[PDB]
Design a protein around this ligand. Structure first.
Ligand SMILES: [Ca+2]
Ligand SMILES: [Ca+2]
Ligand SMILES: [Ca+2]
Ligand SMILES: [Ca+2]
Ligand SMILES: [Ca+2]
Ligand SMILES: [Cl-]
Ligand SMILES: [Cl-]
Ligand SMILES: [Cl-]
Ligand SMILES: [Cl-]
Ligand SMILES: [Cl-]
Ligand SMILES: [Cl-]
Ligand SMILES: [Cl-]
Ligand SMILES: [Cl-]
Ligand SMILES: [Cl-]
Ligand SMILES: [Cl-]
Lengths: 365, 365, 365, 365, 365
């Protein structure tokens, strides 16, 4: 992901205009393959119309240039690009709001399960490993950068995510469908077995534990649904055909005709169509937004990095559930043990923000 | 459903332009029946105006051609198409977010109910079959591909979804309304009977079980409401009349008049109206999006496949509640039993994504 | 409500164009009273300008016709109609998502309350009748077709919804406000009295029962709020004045002036303004959408039928809590008692939809 | 609030056009102070250009009239007015969805707390008074019509909302911030004290009681956040400057120039600019919608009446909690004690709505 | 934050027009750095074209001026500015709806934990300090005004937020990732230890306590996600390039050409382009809205003040859990002890709002 939040913290003169000189993640990196083709096609007609076509077949070219010029209209293209990109962006954000984070589950696992030895440590570690295997098994059929890292189910055994005893059991289900739901049942069975062992001392705690897994199930199912069902191909093709039809009329129609005929529109012969190049840039960088965000789990620059998340979620969870169970800092009296209104200090660099408390809009009347 | 997510993973040169050469699910498969009619109507006037109408009735045709040309405007049509398709798409996605998945219920059924013999197996199997019959009875009055598969309630008995003992009981209710709510009451009564049998050992578990059925009830009711209440016919007709009025003025008005009169707009006699055909394609593929997504439960290409779901939900649930109840893989020490920070390996093919952890935006100041 | 979902299941040639020949619920049924006025007003000027006004006062009419022609612009009208109808439709759907359905409460009432005789039957029946009276008392101050059916609170007694013992108690509150909240308190008091009688055997069940009534309270309050607070009259009037100002300039300004003066725009004298009639139809059918959906609880064609719902909810609930309490079909072994993978059959008519299970996007790489 | 729902129940000929003759809440009541200024400014130039400026300085005025006429465009103004009003309306509705209604709390207070004498009546009354004081203390810093009614915290004592014993305790906190959170802690402490007194007989009931106060806390905090943080002044100023710049060019540029020069656009000398007045009305009634709804808690006509709500919520709650605790109507057999399908009667006035139950879309195939 | 809600309470004549004379937070404070550059660039050509370029190179300038005039169109720019600002504003509000307020947790901490001495006071104070440390550790990596106030983790010790015993424990985790999740585990462990000490007397209360921390975890994670993932740089750059391309063609093309050639558009030589300056103001104040709200946690004027919140949340919580635990005002009979309908008085200043209760829309029929 491209991060530029610190560069746009304040609205100053050189804030947004300085983002036009960045290479990675910018339109200059995506439009390179198409600008060359457009320029070559444009200059392959200026070199035919001027030195190949004769005077007889040079007046039928001008009637085409003046006819393919009333069909360049900016209303419908700007409607479709703008009613499509909004939907693409809304889907893109919802695809991230459904990413499973095992932070609300490790808090309860580190507390409700009681034990600080063997058979109380292994239980917690397996209970927290199942919820991570569940997310790894789903972020492998939708993402590409994770598939190239775990090409086979035997590669999960070598990385520590799985076990040889679990691989042989997951191989023996006899179902042709995907198998990203088995760990969610293993977790429930292990938790019930733990409850019937004196570890969990109440049924309320067990129900609370199951309620936080029933939500990760939904979050993992929604990602699969989003990947399986995509935006209709009809809607995808309409925008592309509209944009290409618009830009095919600028090749013939926006060319600089011979001024010897004194046409109402053509009066100069500057070589470079600057305002055609700018229009191409502006109207293609709008389509490349959808082209980039139509599949957030890829290998682009503005795509989710779903390969450091599965390491952070492993390390943090394994630390929280194992090495931080009965470990708290010493309990001591605070600095404000006897003080009605604490007054934290302000540094010299930050003394403008010493504001007063808001007391209602109608206070000053 | 048409899936093309893997073809648009990255934003490259040949990514969106390569989707215009696909047959299934494209505008070329939907516009075939109307393009022929439009072309025939267009060419039936070029063949009358040129060789049937006389010179007297050839100058009243040109006043019609130049008069039916100021009524071709692209603003209101592009407003209605764009304020209608967005609503259609928003309804289409919500119709899928309400599909009942029995994955959050089988997890609790496989755990809370205790027994690994007869009278403890049949209980779980019937409890999980009722929730499937409930979804089958509703995905039969809204969908067509399921109705043609189960034309009669006697066909459900032969497929294993129902039983001869329950058919005779559902036939004896004496109510003229639909009967998609009976299994949701049978489930509750069976669960209460199971609780008063020593199977479920607490009331918290039973309440948790009922809470997950009270949600499937809402999800099944919302689909019926969506099917019963549709977008107003006034709104549906306005867009159609606008589009047809727009395209009826292109038959007479966009024709190539005789250049012998030197009209301000007509100066060439190219046979094929390429930029009229392109406009027809672009402005009809936008309407066909709504035409296709106005009823997601049909027999189109970009329509929900609600016939493999009812098989997957049966097999997965029946496997989960029967053959995986007290079945867990062996519990063993992990690969990182003594390791503060696990370091999973990276393959050679995926070594660019070894990124560093984000530590806040203001870290670098 | 007008239902046409089965007519638009598939996207075929004659799918949307066949909806323009329907009478009920169409623009032809709403625009009849105003098309006549528009036509009469239009033809009352063609009959004055041509045979009443003299040659002196026939050249000040044409300067008005050519001046009231640059004020016909389609952009602001299409903006307001399109930013208003979307809000109207969004409110219309939310008014239906708040309709109380007593299906999540009857499930718990038929199970938690224990008894299969007198004093255990009357309790359940009264508990389920209070929740129905609560919805009847609110769908009587917002809807008209229900008010005309129950004009007085004494009419509810004669229909079985109320009782003579409760009518005299609801008459004796001494509050000037509406009384649609009393049954929600009667239900709670009756449930607590039942709990302190050995009927409900736990407090978890009673809390679960009260949680499902605390939601119906919100759903009933939201409908009253929606009816009490409406879209601002300023916003309602702006659209009407814009549309009427647009259509008042088409009466004088779109008329066919005398071609003897050779004006730049008028060159023909066809009697019927076809493209003015079509514009009127298109731009008034858009306003009638908001005109119809601004109050869903009315007596139109595309309005909610809130008179069969209050019968279905009564019959279904009374059957569920009375004649289906301890009544379940016999428990027998399934057809798939010993079968790892069930294979339901496919009929001959539906054999194209035998699709294969989706196994992830990146499976084929 | 202005209520006109009953006048627009059905879509008839005289439905929306009859709303243009209403005084209160209409554009005619809001645009009066500005139409006079606009008319005076317009007619102060027609009276200078015609009888003050000489022939020399009457030909530099016409170049200004013809030059300040290509800057009157309706695209950007209609975009901003329409992308701003939608946000204003969305905020306006959310400001009402967060109004605290103490209807879900009194139901539980009237049931869970057990006692029908002194020390069981006072407890319930104080518990229900704290939740009302909490809402009164917040609907006094955001609203003006409530601040003018309770200008001082001593005025709450005289109205019965507060007590002299609570005023002295709320005066002795020593915090400069607002004090709208104290009753929410008093309620919790009183409920815990009641539980440790034999009144509430279980912890589940107490937790359910606290869960309904933790939601009113959020609802009261959201109103304060909405009042404290408003729409950015930049966004507010942009629309005003755009509208005023648009309307300043219509003073000089839409004037009726002397027709003695035969200009391409000016050919008549009608005194009143009817289509300029209509445009002013239409384009300023759109801005006044935002001007009115930018602060719903005011003293306008289309503003929330937050002064009858705080009386209804007091009377209803005090009646439900105190005088309706153990008070239920007699329990008797229903009219349909032995009847499988009840058949409520239909009156003669409402006999058209006897519709048949919907049985699915695909029923007729 | 800029607060002007009290100035726009009512819709009067001088309500919105009076907001154009405010300095702080206005467009005049943001456009100062760019207006000077634009004016200098504009006047550097009027001073070259008029007194530097010769008559030969003064006719190639006018063909550029007349050619750089058909590319000034307001449709696409007003589409992109308006489809971008809406998304920016929607993100800006959601960034505030996720701010953690410890008001729903202190209510339960002040009640469920039982004790009014030492070892019962320290427990509550530490339990409430952990939830504040959790929010301080996250509002330090996203905000700048808080980072400049706490540049180092040792500065938190000196302000009372942290302790020397917990600093040494947070220094000893051995993880390279951010450490904003440790207090949420410390809180859970301390609460479980308190429960196994006789302080919390039930498991329902402990589960309710943990449920309110599992929500603050999500609220704190969402802010970090919003800061880490920003709007795509492609979409950010497209708007800037469109606006700058629009405003670069107004420098040459909107200049006042020599009227000696009698051009169709240029006929006057007024020095100041008033309607170009106004367009610049209007089209740059729209971009500066996004420029300001693209990062709400900054040091602008319309930016969240996240430095008084962390003091209010500390003081209020510490007062609630320590000095207000078993402290309630005396319980006395109300003013309306025997009164069916209370009648609070109305002041003379507010007597217009004595409205009558709404009794349904169809009441008057
Ligand atoms: Ca991508
Ligand atoms: Ca379909
Ligand atoms: Ca209606
Ligand atoms: Ca107001
Ligand atoms: Ca900022
Ligand atoms: Cl799911
Ligand atoms: Cl160019
Ligand atoms: Cl429902
Ligand atoms: Cl053509
Ligand atoms: Cl409510
Ligand atoms: Cl016409
Ligand atoms: Cl809050
Ligand atoms: Cl005028
Ligand atoms: Cl999270
Ligand atoms: Cl200018």
């Amino acid at each position: 992901t491209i991060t530029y939040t610190n560069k746009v913290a304040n609205a100053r003169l050189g804030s947004f205009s300085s983002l036009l000189l960045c290479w990675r993640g910018s339109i200059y990196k995506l439009l390179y393959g198409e600008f060359l083709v457009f320029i070559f096609l444009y200059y392959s007609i200026r070199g035919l119309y001027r030195m190949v076509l004769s005077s007889d077949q040079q007046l039928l070219f001008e009637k085409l240039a003046l006819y393919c010029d009333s069909y360049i209209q900016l209303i419908p293209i700007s409607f479709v690009l703008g009613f499509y990109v909004t939907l693409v962006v809304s889907r893109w954000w919802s695809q991230y709001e459904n990413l499973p984070w095992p932070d609300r589950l490790m808090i309860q696992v580190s507390s409700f399960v009681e034990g600080k030895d063997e058979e109380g440590r292994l239980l917690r570690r397996t209970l927290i490993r199942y919820a991570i295997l569940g997310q790894v098994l789903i972020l492998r059929s939708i993402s590409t950068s994770v598939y190239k890292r775990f090409p086979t189910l035997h590669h999960l055994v070598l990385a520590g995510f799985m076990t040889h005893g679990e691989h042989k059991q997951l191989q023996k289900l006899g179902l042709p469908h995907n198998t990203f739901w088995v760990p969610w049942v293993w977790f429930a069975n292990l938790s019930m077995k733990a409850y019937l062992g004196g570890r969990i001392r109440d049924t309320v705690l067990l129900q609370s534990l199951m309620n936080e897994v029933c939500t990760l199930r939904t979050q993992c199912g929604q990602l699969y649904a989003y990947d399986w069902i995509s935006i209709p191909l009809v809607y995808t093709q309409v925008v592309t055909v509209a944009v290409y039809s618009f830009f095919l009329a600028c090749l013939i129609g926006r060319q600089f005709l011979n001024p010897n005929k004194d046409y109402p529109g053509h009066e100069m012969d500057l070589v470079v169509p600057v305002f055609t190049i700018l229009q191409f840039l502006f109207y293609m960088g709008w389509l490349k937004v959808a082209e980039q965000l139509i599949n957030p789990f890829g290998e682009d620059d503005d795509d989710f990095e779903t390969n450091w998340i599965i390491d952070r979620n492993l390390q943090v969870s394994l630390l929280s559930v194992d090495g931080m169970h009965q470990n708290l800092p010493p309990m001591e009296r605070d600095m404000y043990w006897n003080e009605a209104a604490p007054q934290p200090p302000y540094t010299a660099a930050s003394a403008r923000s010493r504001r007063h408390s808001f007391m209602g809009s109608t206070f000053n009347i």
